[PDB]
Design an enzyme around this catalytic site. Structure first.
Site, PDB file in Angstrom:
ATOM      1  N   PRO B   1       0.825  -1.230   0.000  1.00 12.00           N
ATOM      2  CA  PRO B   1       0.000   0.000   0.000  1.00 12.00           C
ATOM      3  C   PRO B   1       0.849   1.265   0.000  1.00 12.00           C
ATOM      4  O   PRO B   1       1.993   1.265   0.460  1.00 12.00           O
ATOM      5  CB  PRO B   1      -0.895  -0.049   1.227  1.00 12.00           C
ATOM      6  CG  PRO B   1      -0.946  -1.540   1.525  1.00 12.00           C
ATOM      7  CD  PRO B   1       0.402  -2.130   1.087  1.00 12.00           C
ATOM      8  N   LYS B  32      -1.864  -5.531   5.761  1.00  7.87           N
ATOM      9  CA  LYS B  32      -0.664  -5.755   4.964  1.00  7.87           C
ATOM     10  C   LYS B  32       0.557  -5.671   5.868  1.00  7.87           C
ATOM     11  O   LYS B  32       0.553  -4.959   6.875  1.00  7.87           O
ATOM     12  CB  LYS B  32      -0.541  -4.698   3.864  1.00  7.87           C
ATOM     13  CG  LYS B  32      -1.791  -4.501   3.025  1.00  7.87           C
ATOM     14  CD  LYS B  32      -1.889  -5.520   1.911  1.00  7.87           C
ATOM     15  CE  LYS B  32      -3.094  -5.244   1.028  1.00  7.87           C
ATOM     16  NZ  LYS B  32      -3.245  -6.263  -0.041  1.00  7.87           N
ATOM     17  N   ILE B  64      -3.812  -2.818  -3.180  1.00 11.24           N
ATOM     18  CA  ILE B  64      -4.322  -3.937  -3.952  1.00 11.24           C
ATOM     19  C   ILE B  64      -5.308  -4.695  -3.069  1.00 11.24           C
ATOM     20  O   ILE B  64      -4.912  -5.491  -2.218  1.00 11.24           O
ATOM     21  CB  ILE B  64      -3.167  -4.863  -4.393  1.00 11.24           C
ATOM     22  CG1 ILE B  64      -2.150  -4.054  -5.208  1.00 11.24           C
ATOM     23  CG2 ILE B  64      -3.713  -6.024  -5.219  1.00 11.24           C
ATOM     24  CD1 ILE B  64      -0.852  -4.790  -5.512  1.00 11.24           C
ATOM     25  N   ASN B  97      -8.321  10.415  -1.549  1.00 14.26           N
ATOM     26  CA  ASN B  97      -8.753   9.601  -2.683  1.00 14.26           C
ATOM     27  C   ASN B  97      -8.302   8.155  -2.487  1.00 14.26           C
ATOM     28  O   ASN B  97      -7.114   7.892  -2.302  1.00 14.26           O
ATOM     29  CB  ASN B  97      -8.159  10.150  -3.988  1.00 14.26           C
ATOM     30  CG  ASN B  97      -8.841  11.432  -4.451  1.00 14.26           C
ATOM     31  OD1 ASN B  97     -10.062  11.555  -4.384  1.00 14.26           O
ATOM     32  ND2 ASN B  97      -8.049  12.390  -4.930  1.00 14.26           N
TER      33      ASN B  97
HETATM   34  C1  956 Z   1     -21.216  18.366   2.584  1.00 15.58           C
HETATM   35  N1  956 Z   1     -20.322  18.183   1.418  1.00 15.58           N
HETATM   36  C2  956 Z   1     -20.785  17.451   0.317  1.00 15.58           C
HETATM   37  O1  956 Z   1     -21.923  16.982   0.326  1.00 15.58           O
HETATM   38  C3  956 Z   1     -19.956  17.254  -0.783  1.00 15.58           C
HETATM   39  C4  956 Z   1     -20.438  16.507  -1.909  1.00 15.58           C
HETATM   40  N2  956 Z   1     -20.825  15.912  -2.799  1.00 15.58           N
HETATM   41  C5  956 Z   1     -18.667  17.785  -0.783  1.00 15.58           C
HETATM   42  N3  956 Z   1     -17.807  17.526  -1.864  1.00 15.58           N
HETATM   43  C6  956 Z   1     -18.197  17.900  -3.244  1.00 15.58           C
HETATM   44  C7  956 Z   1     -17.978  16.705  -4.178  1.00 15.58           C
HETATM   45  N4  956 Z   1     -16.650  16.094  -3.929  1.00 15.58           N
HETATM   46  C8  956 Z   1     -15.830  15.845  -4.950  1.00 15.58           C
HETATM   47  O2  956 Z   1     -16.228  15.992  -6.105  1.00 15.58           O
HETATM   48  C9  956 Z   1     -14.392  15.385  -4.707  1.00 15.58           C
HETATM   49  C10 956 Z   1     -13.498  15.933  -3.887  1.00 15.58           C
HETATM   50  C11 956 Z   1     -12.302  15.333  -3.894  1.00 15.58           C
HETATM   51  C12 956 Z   1     -12.158  14.285  -4.706  1.00 15.58           C
HETATM   52  S1  956 Z   1     -13.652  14.065  -5.499  1.00 15.58           S
HETATM   53  C13 956 Z   1     -16.236  15.753  -2.546  1.00 15.58           C
HETATM   54  C14 956 Z   1     -16.466  16.946  -1.614  1.00 15.58           C
HETATM   55  C15 956 Z   1     -18.206  18.519   0.309  1.00 15.58           C
HETATM   56  C16 956 Z   1     -16.918  19.047   0.300  1.00 15.58           C
HETATM   57  C17 956 Z   1     -16.452  19.774   1.390  1.00 15.58           C
HETATM   58  C18 956 Z   1     -17.274  19.978   2.494  1.00 15.58           C
HETATM   59  C19 956 Z   1     -18.561  19.451   2.506  1.00 15.58           C
HETATM   60  C20 956 Z   1     -19.028  18.722   1.416  1.00 15.58           C
END
Ligand code: 956
Lengths: 117, 117, 114
Positions: B1, B32, B64, B97
């Site tokens: 990892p 792991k 993995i 992520n």
């Molecule tokens: C309450 N709430 C959400 O409901 C969502 C939602 N949905 C949030 N995000 C917007 C969508 N996201 C993404 O597209 C990504 C962020 C990082 C990798 S993918 C995650 C954070 C989010 C982000 C920060 C704080 C509150 C949040």
């Protein structure tokens, strides 16, 4: 294709010609034009492998296609060989993550490589 | 990892032993062996989260297997806890992520983890 | 969503306001509130594109959904435009990897978005 190397090896230990060697050897290995090959080397990193701070590398190779079982083993032999020879990193302290990118998910030149639809 | 943390927290604020602690905790959490765990911390980054430059982190965990709904929730509590306690980063300013890697797509030791075919 | 830019352009050449502009323009383009948007800019990198060390950039955009053919082409036009205008990087020396993240695979605030 894009190849990224993150390593705790010092910048001063990265040899003249390293980026160019990576560019050319990757063009040959992937069968892609060297004009499309991007390389990125990041020295002096705070990292550990197995808990030890001996030289190590964490790498990524992204390509649209030309990623697969036998091909990835070939890339690993090539890239580990280069990291060992040039940066003196033991192959068993290198990880390389391979990504088969969909053309639609790679941006370039104001667009992506999905130009069909 | 492999665990990577990118943060705008100063290098000096990263405690000695942090890499070792991450290594041990991740080995325990993923099941792991520590010999196969890699950790990488990148301080002093130019970052914003929600438009603010207060402490934040963008992280990735590649494994993995051992990636999934409940497991990732457990990892998030563990990792946010460590980042909060050790780097003083608020959990609501952390993204992690998660990647379930195929053995054939992880290079190591001149080959990959697909040794079977 | 989160956007990362790695570039060999010097830190001094990153203009005041750049992170904020990225945040707000990405909020607009992805349809998500700006308080959700994370941005990360990494200057002074050792890189080459096509064997040349002229200005270039390697980027990533992660989003839960809002990733796809036409949407990614739109993101690319937007982001290449900003990189060209603000960092003077030619669009044909930029790569952007797009990731459609599963909500279960994004951690935040001690849990995930699943
Ligand atoms: C309450 N709430 C959400 O409901 C969502 C939602 N949905 C949030 N995000 C917007 C969508 N996201 C993404 O597209 C990504 C962020 C990082 C990798 S993918 C995650 C954070 C989010 C982000 C920060 C704080 C509150 C949040």
């Amino acid at each position: 294709p894009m190849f990224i190397v993150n390593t705790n090896v010092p910048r001063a230990s990265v040899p003249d010609g390293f980026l160019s060697e990576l560019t050319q050897q990757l063009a040959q290995a992937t069968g892609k034009p060297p004009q499309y090959i991007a390389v990125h080397v990041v020295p002096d990193q705070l990292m550990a492998f197995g808990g030890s701070s001996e030289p190590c590398a964490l790498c990524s190779l992204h390509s649209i296609g030309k990623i697969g079982g036998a091909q990835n083993r070939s890339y690993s032999k090539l890239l580990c060989g280069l990291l060992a020879e040039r940066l003196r990193i033991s192959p068993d302290r290198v990880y390389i993550n391979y990504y088969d990118m969909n053309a639609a998910n790679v941006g370039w030149n104001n667009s992506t490589f999905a130009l069909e639809h």
